C-alpha cells in the first residue's frame, strides 16, 4: 500500500522569504494543531498554506486513506518561481528595476 | 569551430581537486584554481619538511631516555661513534621507548667507550 498524499500550488504571488517563515511553524506537527495555528497568524502567507493543507487532507481522504485524526505534516517546501520584471522612474532621469517574485508551495502529509 | 565541450572538462577537473574548501571555494571557477596553485606550493614545501621534523622528534625522545640513564643528551652520539655503532635515530627512538633493557645495554656500552 501507500501513504503520504501530496498537494502543490504553483506560481503564487508571494515573496518566497516571507512564506518560509510560516512553514517553519508547521514542520513535524499534527494536522489538528496546524490549521488552528494558521487561523491565528495575520500574514498573507497564512491564507495559502491553509488551502494547501486542506487539499492535501482531501486527497488523502477521497483517494486512499481513512484516519484523518492520525496524519502528521512531515515535509514542507518553498521553491522560487518565475519573476516578473518592471521599472520605476527614479529622480534625475534614470530608472531602477523591480523584481516581482513567485513561489511554489508543497505539503506532504504522512500518517505518523 | 565551436568551443563546445573543451572548457568544462578542464574546469571540472579543477573542481574535483577542490572538494572540501571553506566557503565559496567550491563553486567559483576563478577562485578555486588559485588555491590549487597555493596548495601545490605548500605540498612542495611540506614534502621537504617531513624529513626535518622527525629528526627533531626522535632527538627529543633520545634526549629524554638518555637523561633517564645519566648520560647527557649528546654524549650517546660521541660514545656510540667511538664504539662503532651506527643505528638510525628512528630506531634508537623506538628502542628508547620500548626496549628499556636494550637501550640501557647500548647506553652502558656508550659509557664504556668514552670512559678512557
Amino acid at each position: 500500500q501507500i501513504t503520504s498524499a501530496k498537494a502543490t500550488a504553483k506560481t503564487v504571488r508571494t515573496s518566497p522569504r516571507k512564506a518560509r517563515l510560516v512553514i517553519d511553524l508547521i514542520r513535524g506537527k499534527s494536522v489538528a494543531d496546524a490549521i488552528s495555528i494558521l487561523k491565528f497568524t495575520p500574514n498573507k502567507s497564512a491564507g495559502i498554506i491553509e488551502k494547501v493543507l486542506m487539499s492535501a487532507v482531501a486527497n488523502a481522504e477521497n483517494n486512499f486513506d481513512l484516519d484523518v485524526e492520525s496524519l502528521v505534516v512531515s515535509e514542507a517546501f518553498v521553491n522560487e518561481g518565475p519573476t516578473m520584471k518592471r521599472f520605476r522612474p527614479r529622480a534625475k532621469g534614470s530608472a531602477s528595476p523591480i523584481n516581482k517574485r513567485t513561489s511554489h508551495i508543497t505539503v506532504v502529509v504522512t500518517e505518523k | 569551430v565551436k568551443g563546445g565541450t573543451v572548457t568544462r572538462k578542464r574546469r571540472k577537473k579543477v573542481l574535483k581537486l577542490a572538494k572540501g574548501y571553506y566557503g565559496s571555494k567550491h563553486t567559483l571557477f576563478k577562485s578555486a584554481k588559485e588555491q590549487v596553485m597555493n596548495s601545490y606550493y605548500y605540498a612542495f614545501r611540506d614534502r621537504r619538511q617531513k624529513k626535518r621534523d622527525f629528526r627533531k622528534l626522535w632527538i627529543a625522545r633520545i634526549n629524554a631516555a638518555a637523561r633517564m640513564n645519566g648520560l647527557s643528551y649528546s654524549k650517546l652520539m660521541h660514545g656510540l661513534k667511538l664504539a662503532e655503532i651506527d643505528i638510525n635515530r628512528k630506531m634508537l627512538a623506538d628502542l628508547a621507548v620500548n626496549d628499556a633493557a636494550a637501550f640501557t645495554a647500548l647506553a652502558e656500552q656508550a659509557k664504556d667507550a668514552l670512559s678512557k
Partner: protein, 144 residues
C-alpha cells in the same frame, strides 16, 4: 607511513611532584618547572597530547632575586584606556601575592591551547603546606 608512537589522549599516566623554592632564583625554578609541564624528560612525546605532570611549588616567599632586581624589575600592565599604564608592581610581589610571581612561568610556555591547559597544572603556594596531600606527591631535588 611507518611506526612511531603517536600516543593517545588516554594512555599517559601523570604524577605529582613537590619542588621547593628556598633561595633559588626565578629563572631556574621556572626553567625546570616549565620543562616538566610539557611532558619532557619522558620518552613519550607527542606535540599534541598533554603528557605533562603536576607541579606544586612551596615557599614562594623565599625566592632569590640576584644582586639588584629587588627594586628594579618593574612589571607593567595597561588597561586599554587612555593614560592607563599601571607600573604598580616591583619586587614587592615577593611579599604580597607571591603566587603571582604564575607570570614568570606563564611566559615560558607556548601560547597555544596547550599553553593554557598545561598552565593549569601549577599550584603555587606561598606558605609551606599542601592542601593536596590526598594525592601522594613526590619530591624533586634541584642540582639544575
Amino acid at each position: 607511513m611507518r611506526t612511531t608512537y603517536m600516543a593517545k589522549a588516554g594512555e599517559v599516566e601523570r604524577k605529582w611532584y613537590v619542588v621547593d623554592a628556598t633561595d633559588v632564583p626565578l629563572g631556574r625554578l621556572s626553567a625546570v618547572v616549565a620543562s616538566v609541564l610539557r611532558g619532557k624528560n619522558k620518552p613519550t612525546f607527542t606535540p599534541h597530547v598533554d603528557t605533562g605532570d603536576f607541579v606544586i611549588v612551596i615557599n614562594a616567599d623565599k625566592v632569590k632575586l640576584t644582586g639588584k632586581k629587588a627594586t628594579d624589575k618593574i612589571y607593567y600592565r595597561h588597561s586599554m584606556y587612555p593614560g592607563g599604564l599601571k607600573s604598580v608592581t616591583a619586587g614587592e610581589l615577593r611579599d604580597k601575592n607571591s603566587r603571582r610571581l604564575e607570570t614568570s612561568v606563564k611566559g615560558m610556555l607556548p601560547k597555544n591551547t596547550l599553553g593554557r591547559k598545561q598552565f593549569t597544572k601549577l599550584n603555587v603556594y606561598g606558605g609551606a603546606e599542601h592542601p593536596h596531600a590526598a594525592q601522594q606527591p613526590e619530591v624533586l631535588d634541584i642540582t639544575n
